[PDB]
Design brief:
It is classed as hydroxylase regulatory protein. This protein has a single domain, classed as Alpha-Beta Complex (Phenol Hydroxylase P2 Protein). The protein contains 2 helices and 6 strands, in the order βαβββαββ.
Length: 141
């Protein structure tokens, strides 16, 4: 009837504190087998923070692609996309140093998987190339 309860520090070191939760769900890092996904990681600084918000949600949300999904891991942002992605030159560069360049991105950062080619004002990074082996997908003897 009169069951008093005041915290659980007497058992928190065993109840919820001892349930081996660091061995239930892993996925800390899986292996990828021959994938044509568009990947590229950029340092998480006051630079990426803003530009990323714009660049992606501005163009990729308003009109560009529903993919270009970001993933926050240890500290840097994980920008992954399906098929191909393309960054505009004017949004980020504006906040990342107005009148900046285009190849600034994917030049030599943490990593940027995908072929980047710029044209006028807007660079596109591909990671598929339409499949280098579309007709040679298989060849034996």
């Amino acid at each position: 009837m009169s069951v008093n309860s005041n915290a659980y520090d007497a058992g928190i070191m065993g109840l919820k504190g001892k349930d081996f939760a660091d061995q239930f769900f892993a996925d800390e890092n899986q292996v990828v087998h021959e994938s044509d996904t568009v990947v590229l990681v950029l340092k998480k600084s006051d630079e990426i923070n803003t530009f990323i918000e714009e660049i992606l949600l501005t163009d990729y949300k308003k009109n560009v692609n529903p993919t270009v999904n970001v993933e926050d891991r240890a500290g840097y942002w994980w920008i992954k996309a399906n098929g191909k992605i393309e960054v505009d030159c004017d949004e980020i560069s504006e906040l990342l140093g107005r009148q900046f360049n285009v190849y600034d991105f994917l030049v030599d950062v943490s990593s940027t998987i995908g072929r980047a080619y710029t044209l006028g004002n807007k660079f596109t990074i591909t990671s598929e190339l339409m499949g280098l082996d579309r007709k040679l997908e298989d060849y034996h003897a």
